[PDB]
From Swiss-Prot, chains A, B, C, D, E, F:
Originating gene: MAPT
Listed result of changing residue 2 to N: In FTD1; minimal parkinsonism; very early age of onset
Name assigned to this protein: Microtubule-associated protein tau
Modification sites for N6,N6-dimethyllysine: 8
Organism this protein belongs to: Homo sapiens
Species classification: Eukaryota, Metazoa, Chordata, Craniata, Vertebrata
Site positions per UniProt: Not glycated: 8, 14, 18, 28, 37, 40, 67, 72
Omega-N-methylarginine: residues bearing it: 46
UniProt free text on domains: The tau/MAP repeat binds to tubulin. Type I isoforms contain 3 repeats while type II isoforms contain 4 repeats.
Residues found modified as Phosphoserine: 2, 21, 49, 53
Length: 77, 77, 77, 77, 77, 77
């Protein structure tokens, strides 16, 4: 019993943008207040956590395009 | 018993945009207030959590396009 | 008993947009208030949670287009 | 007596195609026979000729599109 | 008497194609036979000729697109 | 009497192709036979000729695109 597998996908795909100008952008939020009160913090087994955060973000990429691919050939016996 | 598998998908797909100008954008929210009160925090087994957060975000990508692909050939016995 | 599988899908698909200008956009919400009170927090077995959040978001992508594909050939015995 | 010619043709044309796949094509003609008998051949000036030819042609272009133009301003006296 | 010619043709044309795959092509003609018999051949000036030819041609271009132009301003006296 | 010629053609043309794959191509003609019999051949001036030829050609360009132009300003007297 002979097994033959050929795995030859092809992609010529493009992910693209064009823009004339980004222009004037004004991030001006009023001052927030964040208060958190807790007594104990027990953490185990791959847990991840964020407490009391206050983030201001002004992300203005001229492109900002993204492509994701995954290929996976798996074999048993 | 011979098994032959051929895996040859083709894509020439495009994900694209054109824009004249982004123009004036004004992120100006009033100051929020966030209060959280808790006594104990027990965390285990891949849990992830966010408490008391106050996020202001002004994301203005000139493209912002996205493509996702997954290929998966699996075989047994 | 011979098994032959051929997997050759083709796509030339496009996902595209055109825009003259994005123009003036004004995110100006009044200041919210969020209060949460809790005594205990027990978390296990892949749980994920968000408490007391107050998010202001002004997402203005010049394209914002998205494509998703999945291919899956599976075989047994 | 003045003369003024402004030859300014503007071209924005496109000649285009899409095809998914060209597929299986089978050029299998039976064997031809060509016999020509002649005694004398006298040629002069701009003659061009072909005798006793047997051509098999397969032509499978992925596009095969064509454009031709012939601009011609002529002036006298 | 003045003369003024402004030969300014503007070209923005495109000749283009997409193809997914060219696929299996099978040029398999049967064996031809070509016999030509002649006694004398006298040629002069601009003659060109072909005799007794047997051509097998496979031509499979991935594009195969063409553009031709012939601009020609001519002036006299 | 003044004369003024402004020969300024502007070209922004494109000739282009995409192809996913060229695929399996099988040039397999049967064996031809070519017989030519002649007594005398006298040629003069600009003659060009071919006799008794048997050509097998496979041509598989990945693009195969062409562009030709022939600008020609001519002036007299």
């Amino acid at each position: 019993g002979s097994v033959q597998i050929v795995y030859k996908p092809v992609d010529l795909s493009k992910v693209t943008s064009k823009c004339g100008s980004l222009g004037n952008i004004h991030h001006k939020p009023g001052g927030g207040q964040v208060e958190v009160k807790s007594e104990k913090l027990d953490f185990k087994d791959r847990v991840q956590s964020k407490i009391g955060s206050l983030d201001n973000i002004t992300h203005v990429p001229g492109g900002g395009n993204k492509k994701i691919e995954t290929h996976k050939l798996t074999f048993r016996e």
